């Protein structure tokens, strides 16, 4: 069955899409960093749905505006057909259900390997952020749920699970029961400014114009 | 000392620095009750083949290292980022343990930074590589006298080997420009070939079991630890601590900073341990240094008298230990105050000046 | 850390002849503030009156109702530079404060 | 002709910034200078020429 | 306009700035945390990375102190003119032009 | 090279200070020969007597 | 007569020639060029021999800095002596001897 | 090495390969095949400013 | 002292604000002059 078509169009990230680059406390200070960011003021894809595979590149940034349990998960790798490890992650109910052992599956679900990892599910006017990357082997996701189209506001985004996995991805497509945005992270280095909570409140990215450069 | 002399002249020399030194040691270690099965790994019949190699994540359990010597006849560890006496001290996040079957030309492969056949198509190993090799002769249990065909390697790729990866796909290797069409043949290589282990060969091609040990070294929530004992903790003391295999030195207070839940340590500007999270009741605690300053000694010549002053920088006399006047400059110990004013003789801090004045005494304006 | 100090006992007397120099410089800031304003051999005090041909010299002569016995103009050099240091006693009491 | 210390220098990345006033400038401060001296004496120093 | 008077500040609190951050460079060690250093390596292995990181630390503060004595040596010179100008012009009436 | 780039990043900030002392030379260069030069107020001509 | 100023030239470029002139020497390597010792060495042995070459080209690169900021300070109070000069001797008549 | 590489007139001796800078930095080299005399510079840089 | 990209020439002549070099100068449009 091929019920899921979706259509495209572009928009501007703005100034979304910064993480914790690390898991330490720092209060009242700028900090350089260079990690995977999504670049300032870059050119996401907004996907409307009601169905091609889509490139992974380095890192997704992923985000949504729309109802709650709308959206069932993601499905990571190479081919996607029970052939080799393809990474399902499905996200519902009280327990989200991620392994990278195989499944043959259709594009929309309903209404050889035995890693079952299991966890408390990422769910819950609000908008859900997430980024997702593979670093040595490690998958590595950060989340961010927001009451509010991406906002002019900065926010911060927490990481949740690590996953040493170790397989090669390169590409990846959603699953659902609307629209929904689509971002591509790149090697950056960024200026971080924390406040007296600790928390990520202002950063400038370095390569965007001299401006930034000098600052 | 300082001055490597006998004779002293009139004025103020700094000397050394007073510190008051630790009284307890405090050592805090998670309280987990497993052991790690490395038996099982160590202590297996089958090694895996190079290009399948095995790796079993080993975590929630009390790591003794010390067993491994019994475990397995191996002549000694070979350890990149740590040192293999000092492992039973700190406390990992996570620990893997790869486990495959080489021969023994290709172990100066297997390491960070090195290349070859196996370091390129079958298992490769990340730059900053913080874990530990071993590798034994396996020559009565992998070798056959009609030659042990189960272990294959990978010969052929594309491209080479990411850090990390299992290459486990076996399709043809198409060495030619035409397409191969999954047919062996002229230019359409296997890419996989067998080991040949002979018990006559000589040590070269010896079969040797390698298991390397990658810890995760990292500031997340520790879960692998040594068999170290965890003490009590203590609040408001000078006290020398280990924390989860950090070691230092200090005061620990309560502090009302706002770690966020996946955070454990704090930093500072000079990359420098502020703030920890005690592991077995998760509270946050401060670390200020112990209590510290400058000592300059106040005399006249030593033709005149041997009697000195101590001027403790920038310290309060309240808490001055490890007659008394209160500067500007810091804490005066041993000089007079007079409200008289002289002319400056030897100077103190801010318009402080002491001499020796009247029997004699130092005397400080 | 006392291996580190066992290491530096053999690097020489750079760790001394640093102290040495900055000592110097800490004599010579001194040296140079009494040379420049240390001129005048006795503390001469102004008159009660005010009147000196008509000149009106209240904005640079010290005013006596303040507790630092500064002029206007010296009171508005002092508030328009922005010292970085201006505690020196009980500095660690202020590190230890929680902040 | 072969390669030269100004090349080698600029080519190891050391290189020698222009003057903000250049000698135009500086010989027109100096004839400024030179006639201010010549008709008046001292007193364009002290005011008005 | 008090320009030079807030210079001196601005140089002494970004030298001192600059010698507290040079804290956190590795110096080619395997860490910047001599604790860390000596509770992951043994003895012998330790050693060369604390003499690195003692040979960057020293480095550091010599640099450090050459910079603290030019600009010692500069602000020495303007404050023999500024006692000059004090004993000139304060003192009696100068005939100097400008 | 990148290898040289990567651990003149692990030694820190030996460079920038290093360009800043530069810089400083530089301006202080522009400044004297401002200081020296730049004293008259208006640029005087000679009368064509 | 123009020695001062022929020797301030020759000074600034024998101070660029001896920096360029330092990168030839070995500073206790196998070979001078980078691109030579990332050829034949690998990863970990061309770390030691770049982290050699990297700290003594540090080190001249330093002295040379010093050795500009000293000159910097001598340049800075000869042109004050020709800016007293030209404020009381061109613009005033001066009755101080010699 | 990285750099542009230009035909050149520089007189080799036959018995030479290589010709260096006073920084003994590689700037004329000979092709091993067609044997030319080929001089190396490196690409094009400078300063920015803001 | 190079080429200037972001910086529209006058024909003005004013005093300098942001020096350049070889007697130019910028100042706030950006003006150079
Ligand atoms: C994104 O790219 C498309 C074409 O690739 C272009 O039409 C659109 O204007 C771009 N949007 C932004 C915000 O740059
Ligand atoms: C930190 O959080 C507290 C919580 O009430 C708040 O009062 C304070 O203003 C915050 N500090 C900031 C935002 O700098
Ligand atoms: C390994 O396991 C076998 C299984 O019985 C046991 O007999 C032996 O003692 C174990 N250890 C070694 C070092 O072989
Ligand atoms: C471990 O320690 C914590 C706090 O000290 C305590 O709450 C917990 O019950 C302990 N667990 C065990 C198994 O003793
Ligand atoms: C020492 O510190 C206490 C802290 O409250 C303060 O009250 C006291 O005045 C200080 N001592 C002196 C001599 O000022
Ligand atoms: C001089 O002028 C000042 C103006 O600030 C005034 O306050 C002061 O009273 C005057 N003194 C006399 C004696 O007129």
């Known amino acids: ?215 | ?365 | ?99 | ?49 | 306009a008090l320009g030079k008077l807030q210079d001196v500040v601005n140089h002494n609190a970004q030298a001192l700035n600059t010698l507290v951050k040079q804290l956190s460079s590795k110096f080619g060690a395997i860490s910047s945390v001599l604790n860390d250093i000596l509770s992951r390596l043994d003895k012998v292995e330790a050693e060369v990375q604390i003499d690195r990181l003692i040979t960057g630390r020293l480095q550091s503060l010599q640099t450090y102190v050459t910079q603290q004595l030019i600009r010692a040596a500069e602000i020495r010179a303007s404050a023999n003119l500024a006692a000059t100008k004090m004993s000139e012009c304060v003192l009696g009436q100068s005939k100097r032009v400008d």
């Open chain 1, 1 to 215: 069955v091929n019920l899921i078509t979706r259509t495209q169009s572009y928009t501007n990230s703005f100034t979304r899409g910064v993480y914790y680059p690390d898991k330490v406390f720092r209060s009242s200070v700028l900090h350089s960093t260079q990690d995977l960011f999504l670049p300032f003021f870059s050119n996401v894809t907004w996907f409307h749905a009601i169905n091609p595979v889509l490139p992974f590149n380095d890192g997704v940034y992923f985000a949504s505006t729309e109802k709650s349990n709308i959206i069932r998960g993601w499905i990571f790798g190479t081919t996607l057909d029970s052939k080799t490890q393809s990474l399902l992650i499905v996200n519902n109910a009280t327990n989200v259900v991620i392994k990278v052992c195989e499944f043959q599956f259709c594009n929309d679900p309903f209404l050889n390997c035995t890693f079952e990892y299991v966890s408390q599910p990422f769910l819950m006017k609000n908008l859900r952020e997430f980024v997702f990357k593979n670093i040595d082997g490690y998958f590595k996701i950060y989340s961010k749920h927001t009451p509010i189209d991406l906002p002019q506001g900065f926010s911060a985004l927490e990481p949740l699970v690590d996953l040493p996995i170790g397989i090669n991805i390169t590409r990846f497509q959603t699953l659902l029961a609307a629209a929904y945005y689509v971002g591509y992270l790149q090697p950056r280095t960024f200026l971080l400014k924390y406040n007296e909570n600790g928390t990520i409140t202002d950063a400038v990215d370095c390569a965007l114009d001299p401006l930034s450069e000098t600052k």
């Open chain 2, 1 to 365: 000392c300082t001055l490597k002399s006998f004779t002293v002249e009139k004025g103020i020399y700094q000397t050394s620095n007073f510190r008051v030194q630790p009284t307890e040691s405090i050592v805090r270690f998670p309280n987990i009750t497993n052991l790690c099965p490395f038996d099982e790994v160590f202590n297996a019949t089958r090694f895996a083949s190079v290009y399948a190699w095995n790796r079993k994540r080993i975590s929630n359990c009390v790591a003794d290292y010390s067993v491994l010597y019994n475990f397995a006849p191996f002549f000694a560890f070979k350890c990149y980022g740590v040192s293999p006496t000092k492992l039973n001290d700190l406390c990992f996040t996570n620990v893997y343990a790869d486990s495959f079957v080489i021969r023994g030309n290709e172990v100066s492969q297997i390491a960070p930074g090195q290349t070859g056949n196996i370091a390129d198509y079958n298992y490769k190993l990340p730059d900053d590589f913080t874990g530990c090799v071993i590798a034994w002769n396996s020559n009565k249990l992998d070798s056959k006298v009609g030659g042990n065909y189960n272990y294959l390697y990978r010969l052929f790729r594309k491209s080479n080997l990411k850090p990390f990866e299992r290459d486990i796909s076996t399709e043809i290797y198409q060495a030619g420009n035409k397409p191969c069409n999954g047919v062996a043949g002229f230019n359409c290589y296997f890419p996989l070939r067998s080991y040949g282990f002979r018990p006559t060969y000589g040590v070269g091609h010896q079969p040797y079991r390698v298991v390397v040990l990658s810890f995760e070294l990292l500031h997340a929530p520790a879960t692998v630890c040594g068999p170290k004992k965890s003490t009590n903790l203590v609040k408001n003391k000078c006290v020398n601590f280990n924390f989860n295999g950090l070691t230092g030195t200090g005061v620990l207070t309560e502090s009302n900073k706002k770690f966020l839940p996946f955070q454990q340590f704090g930093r500072d500007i000079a990359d420098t341990t502020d703030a920890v999270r005690d592991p077995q009741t998760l509270e946050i605690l401060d670390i200020t240094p112990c209590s510290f300053g400058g000592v300059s000694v106040i005399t006249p010549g030593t033709n005149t008298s041997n009697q000195v002053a101590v001027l403790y920088q920038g310290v309060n006399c309240t808490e001055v230990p490890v007659n008394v006047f209160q500067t500007r400059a810091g804490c005066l110990i041993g000089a007079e105050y007079v409200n008289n004013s002289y002319e400056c003789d030897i100077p103190i801090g801010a318009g402080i000046c002491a001499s020796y004045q009247t029997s004699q005494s130092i005397i400080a304006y």
């Open chain 4, 1 to 49: 002709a072969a390669r030269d210390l100004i090349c080698a220098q600029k080519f190891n990345g050391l290189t020698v910034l222009p003057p903000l006033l250049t000698d135009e400038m500086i010989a027109q401060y100096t004839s400024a200078l030179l006639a201010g001296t010549i008709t008046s004496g001292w007193t364009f120093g002290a005011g008005a020429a």
């Open chain 3, 1 to 99: 850390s006392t291996e580190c100090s066992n290491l530096l006992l053999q690097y020489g007397s750079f760790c001394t002849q640093l102290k040495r120099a900055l000592t110097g410089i800490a004599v010579e800031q001194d040296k140079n503030t009494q040379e420049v304003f240390a001129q005048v051999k006795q503390i001469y005090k102004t008159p009660p009156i005010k009147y000196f041909g008509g000149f009106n010299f209240s904005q640079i002569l010290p005013d006596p109702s303040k507790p630092s016995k500064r002029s206007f103009i010296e009171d508005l050099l002092f508030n328009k530079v922005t010292l970085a240091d201006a505690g020196f006693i009980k500095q660690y009491g202020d590190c230890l404060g929680d902040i």
